[PDB]
Amino acid sequence: EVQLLESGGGLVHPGGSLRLSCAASGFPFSNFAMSWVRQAPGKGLEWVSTISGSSGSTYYADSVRGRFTISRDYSKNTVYLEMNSLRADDTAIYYCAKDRMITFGEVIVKHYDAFEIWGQGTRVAV
Amino acid sequence: DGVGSSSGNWHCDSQWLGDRVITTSTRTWALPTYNNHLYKQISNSTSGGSSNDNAYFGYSTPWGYFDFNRFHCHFSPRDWQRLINNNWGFRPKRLNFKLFNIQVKEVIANNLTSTVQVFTDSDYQLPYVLGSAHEGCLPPFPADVFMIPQYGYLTLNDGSQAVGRSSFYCLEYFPSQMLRTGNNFQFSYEFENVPFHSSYAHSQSLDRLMNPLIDQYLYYLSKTINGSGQNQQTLKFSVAGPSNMAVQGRNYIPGPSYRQQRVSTTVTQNNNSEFAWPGASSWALNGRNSLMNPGPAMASHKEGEDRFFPLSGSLIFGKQGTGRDNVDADKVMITNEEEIKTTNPVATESYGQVATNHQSAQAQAQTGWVQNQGILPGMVWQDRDVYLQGPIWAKIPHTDGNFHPSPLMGGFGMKHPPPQILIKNTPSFITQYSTGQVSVEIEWELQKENSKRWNPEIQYTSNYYKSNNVEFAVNTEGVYSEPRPIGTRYLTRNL
Amino acid sequence: VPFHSSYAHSQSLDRLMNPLIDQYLYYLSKTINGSGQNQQTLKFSVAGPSNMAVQGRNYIPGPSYRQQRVSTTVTQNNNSEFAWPGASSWALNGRNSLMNPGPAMASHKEGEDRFFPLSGSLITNEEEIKTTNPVATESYGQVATNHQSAQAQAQTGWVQNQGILPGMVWQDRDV
Amino acid sequence: ITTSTRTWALPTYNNHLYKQISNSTSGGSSNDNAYFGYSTPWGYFDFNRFHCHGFRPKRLNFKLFNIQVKEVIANNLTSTVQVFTDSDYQLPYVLGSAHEGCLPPFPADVFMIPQYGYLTLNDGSQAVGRSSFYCLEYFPSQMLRTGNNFQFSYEFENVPFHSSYAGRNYIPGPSYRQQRVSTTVTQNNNSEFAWPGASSWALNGRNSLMNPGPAMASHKEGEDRFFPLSGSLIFGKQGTGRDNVDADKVMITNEEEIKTTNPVATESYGQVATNHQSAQAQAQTGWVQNQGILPGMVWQDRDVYLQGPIWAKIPHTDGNFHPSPLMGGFGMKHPPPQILIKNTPVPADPPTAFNKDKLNSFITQYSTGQVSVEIEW
Amino acid sequence: MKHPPPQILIKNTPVPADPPTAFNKDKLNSFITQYSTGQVSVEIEW
Amino acid sequence: KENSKRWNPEIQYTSNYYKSNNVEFAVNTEGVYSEPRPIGTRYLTRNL
Amino acid sequence: LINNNWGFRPKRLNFKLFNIQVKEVIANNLTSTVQVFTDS
Amino acid sequence: DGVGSSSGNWHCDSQWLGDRVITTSTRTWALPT
Amino acid sequence: QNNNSEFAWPGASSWALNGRNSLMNPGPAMASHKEGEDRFFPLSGSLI
Amino acid sequence: DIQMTQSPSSLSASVGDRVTITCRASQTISTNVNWYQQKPGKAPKLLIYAASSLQSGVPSRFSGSGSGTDFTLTISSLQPEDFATFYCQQSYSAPLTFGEGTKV
């Protein structure tokens, strides 16, 4: 199958740092872009960041940019979303989503299409 | 030889023999009649002649021609894969061509007395249009039956008009062979010696060639002042070494550069203006501005910037079923040329900086950006990569002098390329078309990879993850498609 | 020595292609959907007979070092002593030397025969080589000078001198 | 036909280990200076400098003899020394980078063999999937005890002689402008312009100084106090320190003999026309800061010094123009091969009960001996 | 058998209908309706 | 040797990662060699 | 080997043992021997 | 043979010849009592 | 997913010889799992 | 930044009867819109991509249409499984944007 286990968990104090991990399995890790989608309590779900399969392109949302940092470790097939200098509104349950579009290195193209496979998610309280 | 006996068999396959490859492709073709057996003078004002940049003068001919100049003609996707993962270099040696099992149809019944005229231009007396990257190539998938492209050429012009030096060629003025349903046509060609294409990527960058553990005996100017204040001028010198690798002395520098505009595949990031033609790099010749495409070979982008591509600076291919005008970004494939970054500057960046003045106590040191850089002694560079879909050879313009004749769209520059092969229908006339077979055979020389690299290479591999269709295979409707552009550079070398 | 070339090309560098066949390569035709704000889009089109400016080519014209353009109609020429001040020259060990004749280049565009390069002629005109050689009185071409973004529009510079590049052809000067 | 002989001593490097080194190994913090690579226990011989010994090298001869092993200090007669040369040029070539570790110019001096290391593709301090790793123990090599010796001969490929002398058809060569610096500090600007004012070339988003750069005259004739910022070779005087030494501790060479066919480093190449003149517009000109090759250009390459390097390795690429190296000397596609040497590690007493792990404890050991190198010029 | 009698493959060579009078890069989708017939002799010694 | 008439490309063993702290199958900073994954022998295909 | 080939198998074997060094506990004891044999 | 004469050299490489491969490996060992 | 008990030795398939049980490892050659299931592996079926 | 506005904010309907939700984008984004659904306590699931294409596991009773500014999500044969908050997303350009959502 295709399996996404994200646990960064955590309850942190404002201004504090937290690092989400997402352990991906069952698909070619390099060829798909991985993204984080966020949903606050009783609200709509909000896109946060995405990273190219080759990690050459990282896209951040406007509110997020400059604070959170997305990266992927190819040894452990894990995508990280370290967030620092957190704020009150960062409280939400974060999701890890695989992209629908398969890519390779030999063509310049946008790396995001649609979120095909999501994940159960973790809670970040602050 | 006979009406009821075939004149040739079907040859498609590849032999991998030691240091050499032999590719053979056979296709089924159909040739119509063009222009009602006529020559018709063509100019731009015929179609309305909007721009002087587009203003042309030339003719169209009744003749057709064969173009096998693209790699997917001679190489299956698997043959291409065997070649690129196992080899540091390749280049053609001999060429072989056959035109056989001809049939002519009166428009639809059999005309057994009709002929087809074919000739090759082996003195290269005709305008050579095979290096222009035109459509009409032998199909990549051998079960596709293709239509011979109509031959035509251009000559000198002032606006839409001709001039006194303009030329007109009559292809009837060339002796040719006439073929009936039992006749066949063939010839052999010999490629002129060219350098091996480099199907490898450097494992070292041009600036990192140093020993990381040792200092240089060279010195550089580290400090021009002692501190902040008045009259602090001083000259300090330090050893160039591991801790600073930027200032060290180097024997060779990256190759030439002609800067490109940078375009992002994330549309919002791009400027909201029509900068497609206005911002493009061009070169002007006789008052006409011609776009620079693809231009000098340069890396497409810097590390961490794969969303960007040079405007006119890359080769862009269409996906199967893509239209002719105004297609979306997804419908095209923009090739990536980053393997060459080790020795080549980034296409969208300046070559570097130069000093623009003389410093003094009254003037600060001023530098400026080099937007374009011609050849300098000590430069080393990589040529442009070749693709499964892309061109094989081109003809070197016949001129007093040239530099590094390797063509700018990739492939093998040749002063005596494979000769053009012209074909027609021998003609108030009877509506008529001919069909038949074509087989091409090429011998390739190979350079084996002799690397002592310990860790395993990057390889080209088909993905295993499940999918609706097999890549490089037909769909349910029967359409064959090539899902991506495959470069040749996978294996590595030391710089 | 090589044979001195004594012929004029009937074809130009920009006119090498087959006028009846579309190229299999795409170029970027349009960067905006329409007029107004937030219209960014990426559109690509096949290069073909209709547009011959945007096609890909394997070879580019030879080097150029620009000359000042002087007219045989005296009134058209500027009212100043620019014979020396406006001349293209090269400096060697502190000594300015005029560039004469200089790199072989087309003396004028087609359609203007009243102009000649300041130091660029021996008045023998080279216009027969305007096929592969740029024009001594013109810019070699345009170069992008920056990175365009939502804030900054694309910008282009002029190339007054251009050194040898891979894939250049040229004609030498005539005897 | 010069001949040279020296005495050397070889220690143990990296405790008999190959170890990844990188930007963050040295503390890093800069993208221009970032690197990724490996440090090997092997040493190598550098005779590449002239003082280790028109004109041009023809053949070569190398010998390694009088092997002496030293265990800590007593001799060790059983121990071996491994030596091999790379004649297929399959290892990264570090001999053309103008490093230290040469045979000393004075025949009675003794020299320590420098450590072999190499760099490969990096991104930041990390490694790209295209990076390469090399175990030199994977090459066939020759092992030498105190009675064994090693020698080989090399043939230099055909190169041009090095020049050893000091309305127009031809023009001077290409220029890439260097910033001008006066030996009088009071004339120089009171600002830190060492890296800010330098001429550079950027490759893959990393700025590299242009050093020494194209071959040009250092200064206009009659001005002897100016030298190009990065444009000249600068040699240290005996005793000169490693860091921030004043201008009297170094030797700043001048190329001024080549000013006949070459442009001055700190001067513009010339002028060009920037517009069309007319009755409304004056004739305008502009300065040529950088000029590439043109038909009809002639130039002289960089002169060689007694301290200077002999040869370089021409990179393996699709194309190059005038492969003669910029730091000077004879450029070659198949240069003199690298010569690699190390002491074979000797394991100490084993634990006597089996253990899976590799042996991490060795006998402290080094070797010393003689090297003779002969070249036909 | 590990090397049984080899498969024998047969098809009618496509003969296209009248192509257009202007060049079109797309493959020919229109063909002359056709079929074949003949004799097969197979000899097996036992 | 393999003489397969397969039209499409095979599956190959390749090094997938793009940027990483250690190249696979090479020493680390401490000088310790490691084999990152177990590699099988079966990539090319045959007809059954 | 695995990318290019459908099969493999060993053919011949060549074994060698050399540069023996026997130590005493640490100095070189030159008169000692090493007992080695193969059971064929 | 002797104390100062080597009884062998260091051979590690792999030769790819036609339809065969030849692999060679050399290591350094220690044998306790 | 696994049962909350100790089945490593009790649940393992094995073969007895002369009165001594021995684990069947790795055992006959068999596919490790059905297609689409990568998370399951035989108890002693594959090399580790 | 591109804004997706989904016109019904909340909705309720009888089962089996057709339901349609639409959202209007701030600019011509062509066919880039995507559709999702989220049940309480469960991660979202992709329905439609590239404006009309449906995901492999999604029932044929879902469909979608439109180009440029306007896009509609039509549900024929509504069912008890189908009651959840629904979202539309642009894939056209980053930063990516989800609609406000429609609780059905």
Author numbering:
A (entry chain H): 20 to 145
B (entry chain C): 219 to 325, 334 to 653, 669 to 736
C (entry chain B): 420 to 541, 560 to 612
D (entry chain A): 240 to 292, 307 to 325, 334 to 427, 475 to 685
E (entry chain D): 640 to 685
F (entry chain F): 689 to 736
G (entry chain F): 301 to 325, 334 to 348
H (entry chain F): 219 to 251
Paper text:
The AAV vectors are composed of non-enveloped T = 1 icosahedral capsids, consisting of 60 viral proteins (VP), and package single-stranded DNA transgene cassettes. A major challenge for the utilization of AAV vectors in the clinic is the presence of pre-existing neutralizing antibodies (NAbs) in a large percentage of the human population. These complex structures provide unprecedented details of the mAbs binding interfaces, with many antibodies inducing structural perturbations of the capsid upon binding.
For the sixteen 2-fold binding Fabs, this strategy resulted in maps reconstructed to 2.54–3.56 Å resolution. In all maps, the VH and VL chains are well-ordered, enabling the building of atomic models. The epitopes for the sixteen 2-fold Fabs comprise VR-III to -VII, and -IX of the AAV9 capsid. Furthermore, for all the 2-fold Fab-complexes, movements occurred in VR-IX near the 2-fold axis. While, for AAV9 capsids in absence of Fabs the residues 704–707 adopt the same conformation in both symmetry-related VR-IX loops surrounding the 2-fold axis, there are numerous variations of side-chain orientations in the different Fab complex structures.
